[PDB]
Design an enzyme around this catalytic site. Structure first.
Site, PDB file in Angstrom:
ATOM      1  N   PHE B  28       0.845  -1.189   0.000  1.00 18.46           N
ATOM      2  CA  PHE B  28       0.000   0.000   0.000  1.00 18.46           C
ATOM      3  C   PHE B  28       0.885   1.245   0.000  1.00 18.46           C
ATOM      4  O   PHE B  28       1.254   1.750   1.058  1.00 18.46           O
ATOM      5  CB  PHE B  28      -0.894   0.005   1.237  1.00 18.46           C
ATOM      6  CG  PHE B  28      -2.153   0.812   1.080  1.00 18.46           C
ATOM      7  CD1 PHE B  28      -3.363   0.186   0.804  1.00 18.46           C
ATOM      8  CD2 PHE B  28      -2.138   2.195   1.239  1.00 18.46           C
ATOM      9  CE1 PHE B  28      -4.542   0.925   0.695  1.00 18.46           C
ATOM     10  CE2 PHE B  28      -3.314   2.945   1.130  1.00 18.46           C
ATOM     11  CZ  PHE B  28      -4.516   2.306   0.859  1.00 18.46           C
ATOM     12  N   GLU B  32       1.756  11.563  -1.577  1.00 22.32           N
ATOM     13  CA  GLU B  32       1.030  12.819  -1.466  1.00 22.32           C
ATOM     14  C   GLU B  32       1.281  13.804  -2.596  1.00 22.32           C
ATOM     15  O   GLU B  32       2.409  14.008  -3.036  1.00 22.32           O
ATOM     16  CB  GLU B  32       1.340  13.486  -0.124  1.00 22.32           C
ATOM     17  CG  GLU B  32       0.874  12.657   1.065  1.00 22.32           C
ATOM     18  CD  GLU B  32       0.927  13.407   2.388  1.00 22.32           C
ATOM     19  OE1 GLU B  32       0.458  12.831   3.390  1.00 22.32           O
ATOM     20  OE2 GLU B  32       1.426  14.558   2.430  1.00 22.32           O
ATOM     21  N   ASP B  81      -0.897   6.583   8.768  1.00 26.26           N
ATOM     22  CA  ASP B  81      -0.470   5.656   9.824  1.00 26.26           C
ATOM     23  C   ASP B  81       0.631   4.682   9.414  1.00 26.26           C
ATOM     24  O   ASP B  81       1.019   4.616   8.249  1.00 26.26           O
ATOM     25  CB  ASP B  81      -1.661   4.853  10.378  1.00 26.26           C
ATOM     26  CG  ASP B  81      -2.196   3.817   9.391  1.00 26.26           C
ATOM     27  OD1 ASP B  81      -1.391   3.079   8.785  1.00 26.26           O
ATOM     28  OD2 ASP B  81      -3.433   3.726   9.234  1.00 26.26           O
ATOM     29  N   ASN B 130      -3.711  12.148  -3.844  1.00 22.53           N
ATOM     30  CA  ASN B 130      -2.725  11.110  -3.547  1.00 22.53           C
ATOM     31  C   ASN B 130      -2.632  10.110  -4.705  1.00 22.53           C
ATOM     32  O   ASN B 130      -3.633   9.784  -5.343  1.00 22.53           O
ATOM     33  CB  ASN B 130      -3.125  10.344  -2.281  1.00 22.53           C
ATOM     34  CG  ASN B 130      -3.116  11.209  -1.038  1.00 22.53           C
ATOM     35  OD1 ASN B 130      -2.055  11.557  -0.516  1.00 22.53           O
ATOM     36  ND2 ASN B 130      -4.302  11.562  -0.555  1.00 22.53           N
ATOM     37  N   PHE B 330     -11.277   7.841  -1.050  1.00 19.51           N
ATOM     38  CA  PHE B 330     -10.584   6.684  -0.505  1.00 19.51           C
ATOM     39  C   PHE B 330     -10.239   5.557  -1.459  1.00 19.51           C
ATOM     40  O   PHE B 330     -11.044   5.146  -2.297  1.00 19.51           O
ATOM     41  CB  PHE B 330     -11.402   6.084   0.637  1.00 19.51           C
ATOM     42  CG  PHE B 330     -11.662   7.035   1.767  1.00 19.51           C
ATOM     43  CD1 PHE B 330     -12.395   8.197   1.563  1.00 19.51           C
ATOM     44  CD2 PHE B 330     -11.178   6.756   3.046  1.00 19.51           C
ATOM     45  CE1 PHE B 330     -12.643   9.073   2.607  1.00 19.51           C
ATOM     46  CE2 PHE B 330     -11.423   7.628   4.107  1.00 19.51           C
ATOM     47  CZ  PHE B 330     -12.158   8.791   3.886  1.00 19.51           C
TER      48      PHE B 330
END
EC number: 5.4.99.27
Lengths: 344, 342
Positions: B28, B32, B81, B130, B330
Site C-alpha cells: 500500500f 502525497e 499511519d 494522492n 478513498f
C-alpha cells in the site's frame, strides 16, 4: 447407487407445460446466433479480434485452428463465449499478436467457418465478456399453432424462467453427475477444465432448482422481505425491506428490478431474512453440492430468476412453421424461451 | 435504521471473488500530491519523507527535535499511519534563507527524499490528492477483477467515505448517535469533529446508496447540484438545460453530487432536494445534531473516477494497481468494487 434434485424436464414452468410439440434445430439454418459484444474493436492494440461465422463445429476447434495459422500457442486465442456447434453462429475470437504488422487472416481457410472481419484491439477477449446474443429460430412441424401464438404473446408480457439450458450440465448430464460424485467425497480435482465444468453445473443446477421452487408460489413475482433485487440490464442489486415492499413491487412489475435467485458458493448468498430462508430451504437437501462450492471458493452470486426476451417478434410461414427473433443478455439461453413454447 | 457500510449499494454489483488488501505496508504505497511545487523561497521548509512503520505526528516531532524547534512548528497537510508506506510532506518554520542539512536527519524507517523552502504553511486537508500503488494478493477471481478494473475506467466507483471515517469499531458514528439523543454538549474538540464528521459522512454515504438504486445512476434531474470536475464550485441544474448538462456529466466535466447534511440549505432544489431528504428522512436526530452544531451543509461528488488507472498482473492471483485520487476520496472505495475483503 441412489442418484439425486429436480431434473431438468421436471423444472417448473411459468406458463404451464406447452400443449404442443415442434422441431428445434432441424437444420443449422433454423438456429442463427449473432454475438453482441457491446463494443467495437479499438483499431489498435496487441490483440487481433477475428469475427467469424461457423457451422458444424465448436468455438475451441476454430480457435485452435486460428492459433495454428498464426503460429501461436492455442493459449493465445480466446473468445467471449461458446456458440452451438449444430447451428449457424457468428462470434468473435481473439489472438494475441503484438506488433504494427497485421497478418493476412483472409488466407485462413477452414471447412465450416468463414472469416468476416479482423482488427486489432488492446485488451484480450475474456469468457463471459459479451453483452448478449441475437437469435433467429425457425420452429418446424408445430403441432399447435394457437398454443404457440398465445405463449409468444404471454412471453412478451411476463417473460420466461431464466434457467440454465440443458447444455450447461454436460452431454447426458455428465458434468452435474461428476460434480455430484466429487461432492460426496473430498478427492480434489486435477484437470482445471474438468473442475470448472463440474463446479459450474453444480451451481447452475442449484440455481435452477431455487427458481423452480419459487415458481411454485401463488405469486411468482412477489417481492418479499430480504429479496436481492437486481437492476435491469446490469449487475448492481440490493436488498428489499418490508418498509419498501410496495414501491419495490411496482418497479419489479414494471421490469425495472429483477427478483434474483442464488448462485450458491462461499461468502454470503445476498438474500436476507425471509427470502434467504426460502433459498436455503429450496436446496436444503443439497448440502453436499453446497459444501463443495464453498471449499472451492466459488463466490455466491445473484442471477435474475426471470428472462424478458428483447425485441421479440415472430412470423408464421404456414400453420406449422414459425420464425422467431429475439435478443438475450449474456448467460441466458434461447432454449429457456423455447421450453415455454413447445415440447421437444 | 441506517444503511450499514457493508450493505451500501455497489455500482458494479458486489464482487464475485476475494483478495487481500494491505497484506504488508509495502503493498500500500501512497504518494502525497500538494498540487504545486514549492516556491523555493519563504520562511518554511517543505520536507518530503518516505515513511514506513510509524505515523506522521511521530515523524513531525522527530523533525522538530532535529531542527531544534517547537513541535508545533512542524505541520503537514495529511495524516497517515504505520500500516502503509507513505511519501509525505512535512512543513517546518525555519526563518531565513539558509538550508539546514536534512541529510543527517536519520529516523528509523524514514527517508528524506527532497526539500525546499516555501512561503505558506502546510495545513491539514490542503492536499490536492494522492497517487496510490496497491498490490492485491490471493485474488480468487482474476476475470472478475479484470472486468471490474475495465468497468471502473469507464464508469468509476461510488465516492463513499471509507470505514476509517467512522472510527475504530465504528465508535465515531456510535458517538455521534449517542450524542444526538441528548442536548449535552461535547468537551473534547477532537471528539466533536470526529463525531460530527462521522455523522455527516454516514448520511452522504446513505444518500449515494439510495441514488445508486435508480435505473440510471448518472441521470441528471431538475434541482441537482452539479460540481465542476476538479473543484468545489457547483451550480443547480434546470429542466431547460438537462440535455446539455447531461452531456457534460457523461463527459465527466460535471459531477452529480450528494448532500453532506448540515446547517443552511443543502444545495439541491425541487425534485433532487426532495429525493435527498427522503433518502435520510429517518435520520432526524443526526440531522438536527449537525444543524445544531452549525456544521454547514456541503456538496460532495457522488462518483469517483480514479485518475491514470493502470494495473499489472504479476500472476493469476496477484495484481498491482495504480491510480490517483483527489483529497477526501478513498482507495478502499475503489477496492470495494474489485474484491470482497474481511
Amino acid at each position: 447407487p441412489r442418484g439425486s434434485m429436480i431434473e431438468f424436464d421436471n423444472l417448473t414452468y411459468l406458463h404451464g407445460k406447452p400443449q404442443g410439440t415442434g422441431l428445434l434445430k432441424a437444420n443449422p439454418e433454423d438456429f442463427v446466433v449473432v454475438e453482441d459484444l457491446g463494443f467495437e474493436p479499438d483499431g489498435e492494440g496487441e490483440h487481433i479480434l477475428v469475427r467469424i461465422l461457423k457451422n458444424g463445429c465448436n468455438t475451441r476447434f476454430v480457435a485452435d485452428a486460428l492459433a495454428k495459422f498464426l503460429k501461436i500457442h492455442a493459449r493465445e486465442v480466446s473468445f467471449a463465449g461458446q456458440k452451438d456447434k449444430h447451428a449457424v453462429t457468428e462470434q468473435w475470437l481473439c489472438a494475441r499478436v503484438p506488433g504494427k504488422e497485421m497478418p493476412d487472416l483472409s488466407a485462413f481457410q477452414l471447412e465450416g467457418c468463414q472469416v468476416l472481419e479482423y482488427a486489432r484491439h488492446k485488451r484480450k477477449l475474456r469468457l463471459g465478456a459479451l453483452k448478449g446474443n441475437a437469435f433467429t429460430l425457425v420452429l418446424r412441424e408445430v403441432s399447435n399453432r394457437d398454443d404457440v401464438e398465445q405463449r409468444l404473446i404471454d412471453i412478451c408480457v411476463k417473460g420466461v424462467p431464466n434457467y440454465f439450458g440443458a447444455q450447461r450440465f454436460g452431454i447426458g448430464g455428465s458434468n452435474l453427475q461428476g460434480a455430484q460424485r466429487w461432492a460426496q467425497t473430498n478427492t480434489p480435482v486435477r484437470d482445471r477444465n474438468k473442475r470448472s465444468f463440474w463446479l459450474s453445473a453444480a451451481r447452475s443446477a442449484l440455481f435452477n432448482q431455487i427458481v423452480a421452487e419459487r415458481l411454485k408460489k401463488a405469486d411468482v413475482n412477489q417481492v418479499v422481505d430480504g429479496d436481492a433485487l437486481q437492476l435491469a440490464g446490469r449487475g448492481s442489486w440490493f436488498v428489499a425491506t418490508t418498509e419498501e415492499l410496495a414501491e419495490l413491487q411496482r418497479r419489479v412489475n414494471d421490469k425495472e428490478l429483477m427478483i434474483t435467485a442464488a448462485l450458491p458458493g462461499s461468502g454470503e448468498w445476498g438474500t436476507q431474512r425471509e427470502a434467504l430462508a426460502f433459498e436455503q430451504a429450496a436446496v436444503a437437501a443439497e448440502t453436499e453440492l453446497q459444501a463443495l462450492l464453498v471449499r472451492e471458493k466459488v463466490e455466491a452470486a445473484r442471477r435474475a430468476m426471470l428472462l424478458y426476451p428483447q425485441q421479440l417478434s415472430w412470423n408464421w410461414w404456414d400453420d406449422v412453421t414459425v420464425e422467431i427473433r429475439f435478443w438475450l443478455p449474456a448467460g441466458s439461453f434461447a432454449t429457456s424461451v423455447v421450453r415455454e413454447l413447445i415440447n421437444t
